[PDB]
């Protein structure tokens, strides 16, 4: 999973 | 203003810190480091054929281009063909568009872009170029193969996705959603993960379709040592469709990653990460999965390494089924520091699961001690740069073995970027906070978002004898009162299961987790607020996340239906709920902007977070994890299709709504990456401008030693399959 921003 | 399906201009353009991360690095970690960037930076080249036919001979024609010609002596050349400066500009943020996305497709949104300028005059540009002087052949080919593609709009082109609307290279073009569930229904059927995986359909002289499912690997088709692999290399029957398992996708650039993985594993610095190095190796050779995660395994046991990485076909946001993996590879230096707040996160962790709103019957069987570090990036290769991550993905290994939480420090600074003209759809006061806090809300939200909420829920499964990983006699579903009456088999997995929605459902749920323990007097100390900077935040990451959910409408395909972010249609989801909750909660009112353009206000209402806002959001949060852990995906569909559903229904009218969000959008930063070079004995760091010319050279200087056989190898690759689009 990845947190994008 | 913004025009979608081109990057503007004056796109924003940031470098990577990462000189003091480097700095602390011993001459062996410096060594490792080096050899695994150029694993991962090799194998990111593979994301260019995994993202549209076109972008494997785009990259070959602009690293040829700017091989011979840098971006100021090519500004010379374009300048004297009669580009304006404009023009040459957009010629160069579209260049490192493509660099900077693997593609030409955005990573974030999946939409393609083309460059700002006409086709003819870059025609004349590439034609008169040093690159054609020197190869004519070659660059006249690519760009008669690839020129109109660069250009074309056709609105079967605009977006990627499955069927004759999208563009995908997932699969073949003829490809649709019932072909990705047949051979979903088929890998699993095998027990063989759709991770490192594609699927092409080919028809013979009577029409009827043939199915390859082609692995990524090195080796081909001919015998090796490995037989997991081997033994499944021929031809299968399913629900009367031919089926043909075959390997070596990729397999030239997955060579070079191997490669550079064997130097690596000389300088490894413990006999984990020199086992783990071996299985992806394994991995990578035979095309096998099963070696992946044996290494990811061992990499999981690798606890606080001073060079931090991952790499394989990790993720699968981009595939249009949800099922397989695109390729991504980092390498991450351990920030001590900043790994603090995250170690005591762990120290309250275990106590702040038993506060979500599921029953412990729901609830991992083992607490497994956590990982959570800081890292601050030297190398994040592939589509994009995430700003932390949460892994591995194979939820058999996440149980038994556990997991890693990373927040990547030195992205997170980028993401910091917000002046107060771009914080559109606030009223004016509101404005003042969000810059006060969203720093400090980040690691609050992004905390408990990979902790707490990828970290939990239980996957409900039932193994081949029909005995059940929980009690099936004595658990109750919270929901229905009823007993558990489904589950997880054998060989399915959440993205099996849920397909299309599973990426964006499971970030759904990990914010909401986030969201809701956001609430929280305690998790407000561990961050350490304690007080009105404790409410503070809370007011201003509710706020935000509205906020959110309203700019998420920009990733929203109204002809299609379709969502194209996972991340923004989560939050969009999180709005509809709390719009749902009503009581005047939160409203979204249309508005005229000071520039008499359309614009909207978004009102939240402090004092109803607690008394409405949580509740609804627990009631919500529940139900999400209770349909997960059941694997019950026609109702899990029910309900996240149902908050996703996007009309032009009052008071909202979020289809109105949408056209000003896109009016006032703002483009998502390009982010610059350093390289690192081997001069003799040391290992040097080499870093670039914070401009699009920046990133340009950034890639031309980041394959020294083969950058033309790699543009070769692309090339090559992109034409033994040109047949399926
Ligand atoms: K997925
Ligand atoms: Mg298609
Ligand atoms: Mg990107
Ligand atoms: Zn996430």
């Keep these: ?5 | 203003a913004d025009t979608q399906y081109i990057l503007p201009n004056d796109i924003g353009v940031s470098s990577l810190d990462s000189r003091e991360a480097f700095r602390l690095l011993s001459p062996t970690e410096r060594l490792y480091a080096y050899h695994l960037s150029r694993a991962a930076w090799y194998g990111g080249l593979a994301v260019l054929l995994q993202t549209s036919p076109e972008a494997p001979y785009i990259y070959a024609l602009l690293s040829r281009l700017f091989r011979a010609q840098d971006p100021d002596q090519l500004r010379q050349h374009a300048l004297a063909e009669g580009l304006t400066e404009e023009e040459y500009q957009a010629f160069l943020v579209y260049a490192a568009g493509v660099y900077s996305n693997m593609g030409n497709y955005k990573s974030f949104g999946d939409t393609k872009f083309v460059p700002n300028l006409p086709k003819e005059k870059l025609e004349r540009v590439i034609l008169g170029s040093e690159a054609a002087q020197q190869h004519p052949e070659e660059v006249r080919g690519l760009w008669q193969t690839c020129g109109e593609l660069m250009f074309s709009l056709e609105p079967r082109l605009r977006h990627l996705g499955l069927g004759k609307e999208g563009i995908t290279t997932y699969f073949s073009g003829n490809c649709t959603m019932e072909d990705a569930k047949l051979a979903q229904d088929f890998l699993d059927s095998q027990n063989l993960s759709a991770y490192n995986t594609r699927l092409f359909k080919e028809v013979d002289g009577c029409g009827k379709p043939y199915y390859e499912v082609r692995l990524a690997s090195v080796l081909g088709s001919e015998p090796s040592l490995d037989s997991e692999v081997t033994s499944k290399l021929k031809s299968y029957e399913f629900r009367g469709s031919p089926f043909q398992v075959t390997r070596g996708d990729y397999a030239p650039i997955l060579q070079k990653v191997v490669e550079q993985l064997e130097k690596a594993k000389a300088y490894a610095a413990n006999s984990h990460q020199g086992q783990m190095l071996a299985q992806y190796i394994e991995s990578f050779t035979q095309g096998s999965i099963e070696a992946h995660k044996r290494g990811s395994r061992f990499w999981i046991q690798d606890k606080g390494p001073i060079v931090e990485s991952y790499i394989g076909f990790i993720e699968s946001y981009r595939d249009p089924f949800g099922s397989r993996g695109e390729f991504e590879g980092f390498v991450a230096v351990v920030n001590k520091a900043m790994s603090a707040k995250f170690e005591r996160l762990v120290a309250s962790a275990e106590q702040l699961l038993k506060e979500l709103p599921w029953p412990p019957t729901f609830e991992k069987d083992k607490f497994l001690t956590p990982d959570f570090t800081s890292l601050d990036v030297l190398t994040f290769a592939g589509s994009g740069i995430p700003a932390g991550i949460n892994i591995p993905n194979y939820d058999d290994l996440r149980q038994t073995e556990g997991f890693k939480n990373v927040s990547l420090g030195n992205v997170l600074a980028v993401a910091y970027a917000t002046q107060r003209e771009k914080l559109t759809f606030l009223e004016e006061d509101d404005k003042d906070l969000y810059i006060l806090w969203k720093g400090p809300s980040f690691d609050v939200q992004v905390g408990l978002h990979a902790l707490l909420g990828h970290g939990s829920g239980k996957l409900f499964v039932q193994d081949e004898k029909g005995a059940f990983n929980f009690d099936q006699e004595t658990v109750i579903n919270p929901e229905t009162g009823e007993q558990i009456q489904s589950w997880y088999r054998c060989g399915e997995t959440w993205d099996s299961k849920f397909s299309t929605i599973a990426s964006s459902y499971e970030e759904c749920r990990a914010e909401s987790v986030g969201l809701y323990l956001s609430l929280h007097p305690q998790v407000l100390e561990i961050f350490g607020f304690e007080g009105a900077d404790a409410e503070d935040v809370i007011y201003v990451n509710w706020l935000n996340m509205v906020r959110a959910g309203l700019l998420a409408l920009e990733f929203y395909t109204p002809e299609a239906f379709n969502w194209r972010q996972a991340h923004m249609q989560a939050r969009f989801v999180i709005l509809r709920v709390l719009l749902e909750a009503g009581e005047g909660l939160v409203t979204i009112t249309p508005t005229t902007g000071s520039d008499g353009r359309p614009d909207a206000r978004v009102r939240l209402d402090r004092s109803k977070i607690r008394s409405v806002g949580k509740p609804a959001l627990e009631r919500f949060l529940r139900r999400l994890q209770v349909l997960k852990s059941t694997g019950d995906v026609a109702g899990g569909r029910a309900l996240y299709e149902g908050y996703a559903t996007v009309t032009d229904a009052p008071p909202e009218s979020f289809l109105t709504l949408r056209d000003t969000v896109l009016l006032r959008k703002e483009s998502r930063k390009l982010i610059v990456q350093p390289n690192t070079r081997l001069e003799g004995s040391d290992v040097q760091l080499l870093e670039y401008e914070a401009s699009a010319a920046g990133l340009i050279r950034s890639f031309s200087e980041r394959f020294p030693e083969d950058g033309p056989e790699l543009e070769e190898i692309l090339t090559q690759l992109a034409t033994a399959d040109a047949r399926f689009w």
Excluded: A, N, S
């Design chain 1, 1 to 5: 999973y990845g947190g994008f921003m």
